[PDB]
A paper describes a structure:
Mutations blocking polymerization of this [name] domain prevent Polycomb silencing at FLC.
As for VEL1VEL, VIN3VEL floaters are exclusively observed with the WT domain, whereas RR>AD remains soluble without a tag up to high concentration (2.4 mM). VIN3VEL crystals also show protofilaments; however, these are invariably composed of dimers rather than monomers as in VEL1VEL. Indeed, dimers are seen in every single crystal, regardless of the mutant, space groups, or crystallization conditions. Interestingly, these dimers result from mutual domain swapping of H4 between individual VIN3VEL monomers whereby molecule A donates its H4 to molecule B in an adjacent VIN3VEL filament, and vice versa.
Author numbering:
A (entry chain A), B (entry chain A): 532 to 601
The structure:
């Protein structure tokens, strides 16, 4: 979870939807003072995103592999 | 574009949908020998992903900001 949340927050930050400031605050909050249910809800959001990432990856691989190999 | 493609490929790699090997090959291919149309199609896939990232970011911010602030 924590590893997935950090990786996900990094993706967001790298494209400027959150500033480094919010990233830090989000992670400190998540780790220290997020209630058990708000963690469960964070996990849900991250899981949807993981599914979208899985899909893109499959798409890129499926669509371009043949070309990449030459 | 290129900056967005690299950032996007990094997100994928960080969660093991592609190995560092494919990342490198994908980027070299994209830059050097991807045809103009296959670039247009890559861009489309990346754009869908950018929309999914935008949404997650908004979701996290919208849902948790109040909590993060205390």
């Amino acid at each position: 979870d924590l590893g997935h949340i950090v990786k996900t927050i990094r993706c967001l930050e790298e494209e400027g939807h959150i500033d480094k400031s919010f990233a830090e605050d989000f992670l400190t909050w998540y780790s220290l003072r997020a209630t058990h249910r708000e963690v469960r809800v964070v996990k849900i959001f991250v899981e949807t995103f993981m599914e979208d990432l899985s899909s893109l990856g499959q798409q890129l691989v499926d669509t371009f592999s043949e070309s990449i190999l030459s």
